[PDB]
């Protein structure tokens, strides 16, 4: 089992070469733009759920009131066997005539 | 193991388990360990503690029943499963000798190649491996390769017929549940004391005796003894109208039956359903049973009702070994201790299954079905065993 | 929702067991009006309840099976029909 990774394909087809030369519409992409307005910039700042769960809903600007809010941000089968029926009881207790000979 | 059959030469082999992982004493000691655990848990009050123990013992018994099939019998369950009497084994009953003997076989027997062909699809490749290595020592290539390719070529060959089975076990192998073995589930399986019993059954069956095996179990000829002592309220509560409304039945509930009445049941009627403690060795001892002829199938549903207690090196002892001597056709009794609700479920299942099936209904088939009624399907579901010859309705 | 409950084994056994309990009790809640010879209502749910089976280990699977026997009944266990397909699937899930 010589793992030489020897494969017959060690070149390229000229058909594939020209196909790559012409069809360059699969390697390019579109443009990723950044927030186009301020409101979207803000919502990218605070829209993350980590900030959504660590900030007031009604915006409070003063750090005093922000502290007033954020200080409230803090950090077997036994029950199933209760439904079972009462124990049962076990099915265990846990507790020739001599003949008449004819007289002589 | 000896598979004796008509027009069949004796096929006998060994199955040493002292070289494997689950030795033949490990199983027989785990059975006793589970029995002691059950006896200990029998007096627990906490529902949480009691139910934990039952559910921890059912798993162990389930493990054990499969050990017998996985470790002890090994590549020889085909010798227990009905052998294929079809003219299909013959193609190899001499083909796998002319090479197996050449590869190293010492004693080239010829029946071991026909007792296994039935259910050829059910034959497994690892089964084949042992069947090959043992049959073929020395040269390791042909030894397996030939047997494996030959058996593979013969797969899904045919379908099995009906052939009742009368397994005989010794003084210590009688208590292990050998009926639930995941190869003997569908087939009808009983257990007789010996072989002369099996043939005396035919003698009695030919001289117009043992009427049950001649006509059948009349569904209007059953006698029941329920709750001889006022201790089990759940039983009476469940089986009161069901055991009373039954057409043409008679029995006793609450009061301890008098000796005359119980002797009459086993002698005059055809079926004896016992619901109580033990086997009623208090109201009918083996002594009274031997002093009468048994014309009724015994369905005795109480703890260790069919258990031959091995009180030392001595052989078994119990009521079953004295019903069979009276001519009892079949004998259904539990092997280990049982509780109320599970064995009541088993009894209700079997009775409705057998007495609702209709005329000509094997009892063993509906037992194999009623085994799945108990909640713990391996600790109160695998207990009922059968002693005797197959019984049925008319 | 079953993938969310990863097997931390930190009492995740009780959570998934109490989850199955609720499923069973909801499945066998309302008997069917047509007749008791027909499947219990809301039984197709057990097919959904099957996705949570893998979360239990073997012992809890057996315990939930025994609690399933508290509403099944042997006759219904042996009852093999198309309307019982979901109950067969759930049983095979717990085995």
Curated annotation (Swiss-Prot), chain A:
Modified residues (Phosphothreonine): 74
Crosslinked positions (Glycyl lysine isopeptide (Lys-Gly) (interchain with G-Cter in SUMO2)): 82
Subcellular location: Cytoplasm, Cytosol; Nucleus
Signal peptide range in chain numbering: none
Segments of this protein annotated with the region Interaction with STAG1: 42-75
Region listing for Interaction with WAPL and PDS5B, in residue ranges: 1-75
Site (Cleavage): 100-101
PTM annotation (Phosphoserine): residues: 104
Stated role: May promote apoptosis.
Protein name: 64-kDa C-terminal product
From Swiss-Prot, chain B:
Residue spans crossing the bilayer: none
Ranges of residues in domain Peptidase C50: 219-314
Catalytic residues of the enzyme: 303
Compartment(s) of residence: Cytoplasm; Nucleus
PTM note: Autocleaves. This function, which is not essential for its protease activity, is unknown. Phosphorylated by CDK1. There are 8 Ser/Thr phosphorylation sites.
Assembly mode: Interacts with PTTG1. Interacts with RAD21.
Role of this protein: Caspase-like protease, which plays a central role in the chromosome segregation by cleaving the SCC1/RAD21 subunit of the cohesin complex at the onset of anaphase. During most of the cell cycle, it is inactivated by different mechanisms.
Protein name: Separin
Source organism: Homo sapiens (Human)
Gene: ESPL1
Parent-record interval covered: 1727 to 2120 of 2120
From Swiss-Prot, chain C:
Disulfide-bond pairs as recorded: none
Top-level taxon: Eukaryota
Post-translational modification: Phosphorylated by PLK1. The large dissociation of cohesin from chromosome arms during prophase is partly due to its phosphorylation.
Family per record: Belongs to the SCC3 family.
Subunit structure as annotated in this protein's UniProt entry: Interacts directly with RAD21 in cohesin complex. Cohesin complexes are composed of a heterodimer between a SMC1 protein (SMC1A or SMC1B) and SMC3, which are attached via their hinge domain, and RAD21 which link them at their heads, and one STAG protein (STAG1, STAG2 or STAG3). In cohesin complexes, STAG2 is mutually exclusive with STAG1 and STAG3.
Function of the molecule: Component of cohesin complex, a complex required for the cohesion of sister chromatids after DNA replication. The cohesin complex apparently forms a large proteinaceous ring within which sister chromatids can be trapped. At anaphase, the complex is cleaved and dissociates from chromatin, allowing sister chromatids to segregate. The cohesin complex may also play a role in spindle pole assembly during mitosis.
Protein's name according to its UniProt entry: Cohesin subunit SA-2
Organism of provenance: Homo sapiens (Human)
Primary gene name: STAG2
Range within the parent protein: 955 to 1049 of 1231
